[PDB]
Amino acid sequence: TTIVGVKFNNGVVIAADTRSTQGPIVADKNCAKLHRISPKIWCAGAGTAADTEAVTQLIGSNIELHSLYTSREPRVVSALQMLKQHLFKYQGHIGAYLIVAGVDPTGSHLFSIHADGSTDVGYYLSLGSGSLAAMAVLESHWKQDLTKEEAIKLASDAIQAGIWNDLGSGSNVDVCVMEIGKDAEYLRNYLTPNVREEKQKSYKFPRGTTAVLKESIVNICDIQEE
């Protein structure tokens, strides 16, 4: 997995590749690693996929209830604190490595969080197996006062480094943009640089090819009237 987060002028952007692997095998070619915690707080997850999904939804649920209770729009530091205290308690066994970002009444924020519950702050971050490929690009092209367009470009360039150079990452680039005073725009499959080429042959079979012993209509209906 490759995930990044980049701050810009008036907000924050996160991106991620779309490959999930079982050892050397690609289980899903178009995985969604960008998670919504609240409308304007999204986080990218690397590590154990079930853990990143589960911990993201639990905290998301509790954040929603908190927002309703306080009559306030949720803040990123709350999602951060809730995530880290949960993860720390499980001493790393919940394998969720997250880049947490969003906008709230306080401003725009970017954090990352390791599975053991240690957190950090920055203008640009990366996590996952492709984090070194990504970080090399971030350390090469990042500057102060990025515009929205510059940050999207930098973020997806860093995901591409991971896609091309890391065997743990591949397929497509997802992006989410969180700008102050605007709706978050989740850009699913922002890039598509890995369409499979056309096959040499069609493997559609002549009907009747397969040997059959028995057929039966399976009854999916409930018990019938009359």
- Work out how close the CB of 132 gets to Mg ion at its nearest, in angstroms, rounded to a whole number: 13
How many other β-carbons are positioned within 10 Å of the β-carbon of residue 91?
10
Residue 171 binding partner per list another protein, Mg ion, none, with a CB distance cut-off of 5 to 8 Å that depends on partner kind: another protein
Q: Does residue number 199 form part of the binding site for another protein (CB under 8 A)?
A: yes
How many other β-carbons are positioned within 10 Å of the β-carbon of residue 216?
5
Residue 64 binding partner per list Mg ion, another protein, none, with a CB distance cut-off of 5 to 8 Å that depends on partner kind: none
CA atoms within 13 Å, Cβ hemisphere of 39: 10
Cα 23 to the center of its chain, rounded Å:
19
CA atoms within 13 Å, Cβ hemisphere of 159: 33
> Out of 71, 149, 207, 223, which residue is the one contacting another protein (CB under 8 A)?
207
Q: Does residue number 223 form part of the binding site for another protein (CB under 8 A)?
A: no
Q: Does residue number 161 form part of the binding site for another protein (CB under 8 A)?
A: yes
List the end-to-end C-alpha distance of the chain, in Å, as a whole number. 58
Is 1 in the active site? yes
Comparison of 48 and 194: residue with beta carbon closer to Mg ion: 194
Q: Contact at 8 Å (CB) between 3 and 156?
A: no
> Out of 84, 108, 152, 178, which residue is the one contacting another protein (CB under 8 A)?
84
Q: Contact at 8 Å (CB) between 48 and 98?
A: no
Q: Does residue number 128 form part of the binding site for Mg ion (CB under 5 A)?
A: no
> Out of 170, 173, 174, 184, which residue is the one contacting Mg ion (CB under 5 A)?
170
Rounded to whole angstroms, how far apart are CA atoms 87 and 94? Answer: 7
Cα 211 to the center of its chain, rounded Å:
44
Q: Does residue number 123 form part of the binding site for another protein (CB under 8 A)?
A: yes
Q: Contact at 8 Å (CB) between 21 and 130?
A: no
Subset of residues 40 to 79 that bind another protein, contact rule: CB under 8 A: 48-50, 53-54, 77
Tell me, residue by residue from 19 to 58, as one string, x for binding to Mg ion by CB under 5 A and - for no binding.
Answer: ----------------------------------------
Which residues sit at the interface with Mg ion, rule CB under 5 A? 169-170
